[PDB]
């Protein structure tokens, strides 16, 4: 028997699902064949419609219980009808699935904190999972988060228990350090060597991107340490950090190309 995992998609772009399948320790096939039982996942599951909905119920009714992964924020306006699956408001199905879950893992800034659809003026009245349900969640933010961080947290929760969280529900294992503190451009920052524009010689020489809006100094994530796709990260590609793992970054980190 492999531990049951129910994965719900709410108000999301599916970038978090995509991030998750970029895992290489283990690869996704090995994860779902050997380590977990992924019992509902709309992006890749075979069943559709009534058959899919029956698959969800079978998982929610499972004798061994289940862990809940939530992707996307919850649109709450008009009784939650602006976001629906199988004729039910997303808020309704997420509430129900969360009630008897062994644990709740929010993959991405959207489920964790509200995300892009919550940004002003928030026409769908989108909320993060913890706010909408009124329960604590394990938050794995980033837009999307590193698969290392998501799979890392899943494994930890299944084997060891709940990992130490910060004030924003993020595992200290992955979000304990500022991006900036591990950035290879830090010497330039310390020396006040800033690129004034993307076309400047300074930018060509790899100068710090702080003057171009880099939110690395206020962003908790492990991007420079672990990289993405085993090859790169935004600052290495010459672009400032957006602060995408911070709550409500869409409204607290903008304008993205300024520090104002």
């Amino acid at each position: 028997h492999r531990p049951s995992v129910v994965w719900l998609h709410n108000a999301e772009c599916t970038g978090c699902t995509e991030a998750a399948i970029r895992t290489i320790k283990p690869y996704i096939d090995a994860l779902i064949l050997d380590t977990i039982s992924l019992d509902y996942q709309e992006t890749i599951m075979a069943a559709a419609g009534e058959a899919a909905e029956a698959a969800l119920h079978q998982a929610l009714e499972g004798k061994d219980g289940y862990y809940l992964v939530v992707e996307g924020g919850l649109p709450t306006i008009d009784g939650g009808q602006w976001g629906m699956v199988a004729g039910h408001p997303m808020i309704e199905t997420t509430k129900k699935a969360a009630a008897k879950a062994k644990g709740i893992i929010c993959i991405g800034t959207c489920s964790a904190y509200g995300g892009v659809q919550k940004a002003k003026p928030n026409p769908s009245q989108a909320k993060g999972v913890s706010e909408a349900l009124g329960v604590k969640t394990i938050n794995i933010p980033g837009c999307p988060p590193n698969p290392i961080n998501f799979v890392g947290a899943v494994v930890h929760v299944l084997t060891k228990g709940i990992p130490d969280l910060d004030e924003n529900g993020r595992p200290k294992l992955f979000y304990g350090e500022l991006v900036h503190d591990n950035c290879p451009r830090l010497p330039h920052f310390e020396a006040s060597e800033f690129a004034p524009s993307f076309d400047s010689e300074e930018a060509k020489k790899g100068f710090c991107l702080y003057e171009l809006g880099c939110k690395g100094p206020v962003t908790y994530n492990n991007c420079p340490k672990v990289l993405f796709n085993q090859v790169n990260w935004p600052v290495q590609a010459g672009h400032p950090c957006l602060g995408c793992s911070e709550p409500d970054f869409w409204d607290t980190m903008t304008p993205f190309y300024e520090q104002g």
Binding site: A46, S124, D199, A237, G238, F256
Partner: protein, 544 residues
Amino acid sequence: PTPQSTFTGPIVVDPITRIEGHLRIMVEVENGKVKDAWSSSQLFRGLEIILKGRDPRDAQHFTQRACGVCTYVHALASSRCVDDAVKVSIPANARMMRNLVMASQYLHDHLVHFYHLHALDWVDVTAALKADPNKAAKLAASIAPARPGNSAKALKAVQDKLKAFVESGQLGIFTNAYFLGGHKAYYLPPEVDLIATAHYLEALHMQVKAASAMAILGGKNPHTQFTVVGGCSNYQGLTKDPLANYLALSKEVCQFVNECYIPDLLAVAGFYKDWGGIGGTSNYLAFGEFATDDSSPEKHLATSQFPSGVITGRDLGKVDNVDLGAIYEDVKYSWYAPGGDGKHPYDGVTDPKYTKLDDKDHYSWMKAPRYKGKAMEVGPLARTFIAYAKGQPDFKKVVDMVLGKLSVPATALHSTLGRTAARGIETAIVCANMEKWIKEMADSGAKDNTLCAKWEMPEESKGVGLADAPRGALSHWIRIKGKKIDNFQLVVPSTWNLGPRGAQGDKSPVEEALIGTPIADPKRPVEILRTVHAFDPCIACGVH
């Protein structure tokens, strides 16, 4: 003959799984065939509303989150859009880098779609257990190049792994699969099921490599971070070592496309020949992609190596030029306020007004984009017909190769089978161009690493960004006022393909394609999935 029940009655499939986003399909069935259809998108986010009043430089970061499956493409469209609004012509290297990242995205996107989203509609995974592995190996040896992953040992290993999974009774993502316990609409012999399933697992690994290649130039995947107004920020992406690695990875991915993807697509298509007469539409549109000149939207349209164009009524002899002024969106059958019909995207309005579930008068969060009164299919099939009609050498070669292999006329491509084939066709063509495109940017970058041009934010302006994303013709339209976003409208390929009826009550491409779909078993309507999935729906994209 095509298995068909006698069922008369409605069928609702919600959720449509193995797509991006939340789609509800409703159909009326009579004597086992769909007679009417509705494409009902079930989520609204409202990125266009959220963008109002914001810094135009921020738009690409918000719009990229329109979709994480077709990641990058919206950052690209927004950047082209703002670049046009501020009237900046990006450096040659930036055009090259932006186009290569789009090429990498096509490779990743199409592989995942065929195997992990579409394949389960044609392949019976559990039947793979009944296959003779040795027999499967020799079969695979006849329809595709020699490779260790196609040996009896390797195929048996897959079958054993699958066998242990099924025997556990925890079927996970295969729970209640339409093919469990046999299904008349699934035709493949067990050996083919095993071969396809082995490649399905290989492709889960290969898509990681595809994403890594893309991230070398993109910074990360999903959601790239290398584009800026006036070009790109990734100076390292022009250097020798990273591009050597980019080429190496890209060739691995391309080997898998040519060894596994195309041969499986051809094998599957030969068994489902009847699907070459189901799910056709008549009008095709493409903005084109991979241009040699991206200094303006018109230069993009004229110089795209995958050409732009408009085909109407299946007439492969009259490919018209795209008229950007002719595009508009209707809201009559959508969840938006009345009086929003016929809006050109520069005058686009997004005023949500929900009614109720299954209201025939308003049944979707997608707008209905129309072109001179007609619905337009966009995507790989659209690009393929247009390129074929214009006599694009690569498209001529690869399409004729496919038409030969399946022994059908070019008219058979107007179908769900054709729609599926075209996705494989252009993937092979992208692969064939990779080494050339890379060498171009490698040589160029070595000589002069200029990557971002100077520009100035205008007080008042408008601009449009065009791209042909993996699913089709994408456009972002901006009005700038007081140096801020006054209006920002997205018109996305899935909006074209899967939106609701227009103001005249004319069906969208998916709704028309579903008419005439045979239903072998109403409770397991795999045929609806086959056609819907062939359009490669992206609902977060379509609604935004």
